[PDB]
């Protein structure tokens, strides 16, 4: 079984023609020893490479490439497994510096390559990070076979978000929600989860069905980071009254090629909207920044400081489920809902 | 003011080398008369072109190109306004057939171009169709200045979607939801709206703030198409018990560069989740497939057969708003909610 990788990256810093040449030289020497072939091109501070060989050797080489200080933002665009024929059998690593190339026909191709790479970067930011996950594992997302998988589903929202929109300039509202989305997404990702979408002011994320500990850790880490954010913001910053509620439940989600050819999606949680709205209501009603179902609680392996809060319905069936939180100094909180909303409005009014 | 367009398309059918040559010839002759310059490349059934000239002439030429039978799926990747210098001053239209090119350095570039175009096609399906809208109007989406704009917001969902997941194989569930998403998205788009996201089984869409008539027409068209779908499906098809509820409200949405660098979005409706859940609950409680607020009703200019149904809250404030629907043969419907859910389960159980 032969493997072929295509990837693109950005120069981590400015790189001379002689430095690019040196990259291609050691790459060629190492790949020759590995029986690996391919091509490396650069244009306007972007590297493109196709790399092909026995899968074991490719991954070790690829692991090395990801650690090179000379580039960053490495993106695997295609991974072919069980490759049958080499594209570049005579090139251990052929290097093509397009910046130095002045050939008649290659000039318009460089403009096209540039524009297409830039367009591609724009699209990267607007798609689920899981889509690139599927690609690096050798699968076209549009060919995923449908499957049902149990997940821990994460929902956070901003407390009385409507007050921000009523009290602040639109640019400042966006600043606040960007700070919120950035905190949530960074922490969820480092705990091994995936943000699947933003729904208004609400972040939706998945954790593997048996990673409750990571979903709880992520939730507490977010609450702690938001407390630090509120306390460390400048005087009069709107960030001082940025609060979140977080709910966790278990759901069976559907993975597959989902949607309308116009618009596609990789996953659906049926009735996500109702689960999110119900968790939102529980954080408000309970004055508790973190709530989660018994199914989440019993999936956890660590000895969290669990506290039982109440019964509720999360799915819409006539099933009363126990709602828990974590009892820690942070989550101890006497009045939420209307109390916090009034405070937010008073503060933001005088900003 | 000079304009420059970069676009890609797919051959609508197989095209010979001599036919591609003829395209480039008339393009060159017409552009010479228009004082327009550029380059056209083709590779493996894809056209790429850069076109540059006075904006008026470019658009007329571009309008012609969109109507050519010889290609389809035309996608503008970049539109530069107030261009200062031509890229290709000596080329009215230079044609470069990469399929016929066998040059040493161009072979790896063709592989890269191919892979990058394919990757780009995958990403196209997973991003808001509005993102490409912003690009063709000459703006990088990641540079949008934040703005607040009033919209008609559309929310539809599948009635007792959870029964499908409980009664059917996962592949058939996906079939059903794909049929649903395809109907909704096609009709919303032809009525001038934009689907912004799928949230579980729920479609979220915007119409311009004063296009209530189009949002109502789209809603009725979807209900009519689903009725036709249920009636025309084969015996035992799960599509026979595919029902939708639809809610419309007015909201102020925020447009801008929104999200977490990891994940970006072009728009947020604050508390979208709560508005959607409330409309979902109203369609259930009222046994009415279409509900909408008085703000939507009074925004309509046509003389719809409006019927007043009840008061509700949609936003969470202590504001009681009148809920309306359209009284027509279709929407006349005696029992929903638990009635329909039981029917769906019985039917799907015996499929
Ligand atoms: C853009 C780029 C492409 C590279 N391609 C390869 C490659 O194809 N093969 C390789 O062995 N190293 C490649 N490298 C360099 C590795 O990161 C690493 O420096 C090199 O393999 C030396 O490792 P070694 O001394 O353990 O053999 C590349 C580096 C950069 C910046
Ligand atoms: C891939 C492709 C690129 C084209 N590019 C141009 C072009 O740059 N300029 C142009 O006038 N026509 C171009 N055309 C053709 C137009 O669609 C149209 O056939 C042509 O302009 C003749 O119009 P006319 O007789 O009114 O001048 C292109 C067609 C295709 C399929
Ligand atoms: Ca909220
Ligand atoms: Ca109980
Ligand atoms: Ca539903
Ligand atoms: Ca009333």
Author numbering:
A (entry chain A), B (entry chain A): 0 to 350
Give the exact sentences the study uses for this entry.
Tyr6 plays a key role in the photoactivation mechanism of OaPAC and of BLUF domains in general. In PixD, the BLUF protein from Synechocystis, the equivalent mutation (Y8W) blocks the formation of the signalling state, whereas in OaPACBLUF a Y6W mutation was recently introduced to dissect the forward electron and proton transfer following blue-light excitation of the flavin. To investigate the structural role of this residue, we have replaced Tyr6 by a tryptophan (Y6W), a mutation which is expected to disturb the hydrogen-bond network [Fig. 1(b)] around the flavin and at the same time form a photoinactive enzyme (Lukacs et al., unpublished results). However, the most extensive change is the ∼85° rotation around the CG—CD bond of the Gln48 residue, with the distances of the amide nitrogen and carbonyl oxygen of the side chain of Gln48 to the N5 of the flavin changing from 3.3 and 3.1 Å to 3.1 and 4.0 Å, respectively. The isoalloxazine moiety also rotates a few degrees in the Y6W mutant and displays an average shift of 0.2 Å, and the side chain of Met92 rotates ∼20°, whereas no notable changes are observed for Trp90, which retains a Trpout orientation pointing away from the flavin as observed in the WT [Fig. 5(c)] and previously published WT OaPAC structures. In particular, in the Y6W OaPAC mutant the BLUF domain is closer to the AC domain compared with the analogous distance in WT OaPAC.
